[PDB]
């Protein structure tokens, strides 16, 4: 079996697309329409570092992650047997499985990225070295009472979430822990994935109501429960992937467990494949 994975956030890249563009005329050209601007311009030449600002960076990562996906399709004829995508990519996902069309995901993701660039007074970091069951507690041990779990990346990978000097703070607990070998500061200034969203995810629901969805044709393993979409909650879902937490390792452990599976990462760079080979490896390992 194989899965498609589309990666989100931070996986943009001046130059991501290239070819891309010019084979996919019809939907670039759909593209610009709904943006306003060039969406092949702001790929490849990066004006005013706009691809770091997420308004725009969203828009460019579901569309160069589409246009992959259909250039693969085509070229290799075959389509995955399920589709996952990181946070962002999850669009990508619900794109590939035919529950929008290339033009709502578009209007979608436009949301989102306006909404999430208005967030302010938050942080991220990535702490290295604990699970998640680790980090849950040692915020419970040491009061960082005001901090979320917003990713769960891969068996040591946690990413936490919440108001910039509550974050800060508790970036500095985490490097003073035993198995903490890295704590690092996200680019971002909204406290994503946690509670500080529910308000923008209450925008976002009720916004999704105007638009069309239709049953997947292809099993989309959710962010918010790592199992399948269903058809009815699929506007709930994908507007509580805004205030909950990314199960990614759950996501990718559900899939594996199917058997024989493969995964390609589809868009930008390798970072799902690097955390999908960590999760590989550690459910190769024993307890102790
Ligand atoms: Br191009
Ligand atoms: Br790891
Ligand atoms: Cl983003
Ligand atoms: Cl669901």
């Not at 991220?124 to 040692?138: F, I, R």
């Amino acid at each position: 079996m194989i899965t498609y994975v589309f990666p989100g956030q931070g996986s943009q890249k001046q130059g991501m697309g290239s070819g891309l563009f010019d084979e996919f005329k019809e939907l670039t050209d759909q593209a610009d329409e709904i943006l306003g601007y060039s969406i092949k311009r702001l790929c490849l030449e990066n004006p005013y570092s706009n691809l770091n600002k997420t308004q725009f960076t969203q828009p460019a990562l579901y569309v160069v992650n589409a246009l992959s996906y259909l250039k693969k399709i085509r070229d290799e004829e075959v389509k995955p047997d399920f589709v996952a995508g990181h946070s962002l990519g999850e669009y990508n996902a619900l794109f590939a499985a035919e529950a929008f069309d290339f033009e709502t995901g578009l209007q979608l993701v436009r949301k989102r990225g306006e909404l999430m660039s208005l967030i302010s007074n938050g942080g991220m970091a990535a702490v290295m070295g604990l699970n998640e069951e680790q980090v849950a507690k040692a915020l419970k041990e040491y009061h960082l009472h005001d901090v979320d779990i917003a990713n769960v990346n891969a068996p040591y990978q946690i990413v936490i979430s919440g108001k910039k000097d509550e974050i800060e703070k508790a970036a500095s607990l985490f490097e003073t822990m035993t198995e903490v070998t890295m704590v690092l500061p996200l680019n971002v200034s909204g406290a994503f994935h946690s509670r500080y969203m529910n308000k923008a995810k209450e925008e976002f629901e009720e916004f999704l109501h105007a638009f069309y969805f239709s049953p997947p044709s292809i099993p989309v393993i959710s962010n918010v429960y790592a199992k399948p979409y269903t058809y009815e909650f699929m506007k709930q879902t994908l507007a509580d992937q805004i205030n909950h937490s990314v199960k990614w390792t759950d996501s990718i452990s559900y899939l594996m467990k199917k058997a024989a599976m493969e995964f390609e990462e589809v868009g930008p760079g390798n970072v799902l494949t690097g955390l999908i080979h960590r999760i590989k490896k550690d459910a190769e390992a024993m307890p102790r």
